[PDB]
Amino acid sequence: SMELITVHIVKGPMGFGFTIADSPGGGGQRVKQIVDRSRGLKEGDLIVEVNKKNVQALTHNQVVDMLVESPKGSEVTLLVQRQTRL
Ligand SMILES: [Zn+2]
Ligand SMILES: [Zn+2]
């Protein structure tokens, strides 16, 4: 089933440890790859919010720049939609 999950990720010296790309259904960005830190995130997670604010209407470049600009050593929260069917 589709669940909403809050995940906390501390930005490390090498970044947050994941990559994103556009959702085929147009509801935002999905987690493309977990390059790592991002322990509660999963590939395919739809990013619905960053720091409790909705980001579904933002483009790929906008979400990326939001993460890039987030300060060194600070945490970001993400609300994600995840298919939890095993
Ligand atoms: Zn936290
Ligand atoms: Zn990109």
Swiss-Prot record:
What does this protein's UniProt record list under function? Plays a role in coupling actin fibers to cell junctions in endothelial cells, via its interaction with AMOTL2 and CDH5. May regulate acid-induced ASIC3 currents by modulating its expression at the cell surface.
PDZ domain boundaries: 6-82
Q: Which residues of the full protein are shown?
A: 640 to 721 of 1491
The protein's name in its UniProt record: Membrane-associated guanylate kinase, WW and PDZ domain-containing protein 1
Describe the protein's quaternary organization and the partners it interacts with: Part of a complex composed of AMOTL2, MAGI1 and CDH5, within the complex AMOTL2 acts as a scaffold protein for the interaction of MAGI1 with CDH5. The complex is required for coupling actin fibers to cell junctions in endothelial cells. Interacts through its WW 2 domain with SYNPO and through its PDZ 5 domain with ACTN4. Interacts with cytoplasmic domain of ADGRB1. Interacts via its WW domains with DRPLA. Interacts with ESAM, LRP2 and CXADR. May interact with CTNNB1. Interacts through its PDZ 1 domain with NET1. Interacts with ASIC3 and AMOT. Interacts with FCHSD2.
Q: In which tissues is it expressed?
A: Widely expressed with the exception of skeletal muscle. Isoform 1, isoform 2 and isoform 6 are highly expressed in colon, kidney, lung, liver, and pancreas. Isoform 5 is predominantly expressed in brain and heart. Isoform 3 and isoform 4 are highly expressed in pancreas and brain.
Which compartment or compartments is the protein found in?
Answer: Cell junction, Tight junction; Cell membrane
The gene it comes from is MAGI1
- Which residue ranges does UniProt annotate as crossing the membrane? none
Q: Name the lineage.
A: Eukaryota, Metazoa, Chordata, Craniata, Vertebrata
Superkingdom is Eukaryota
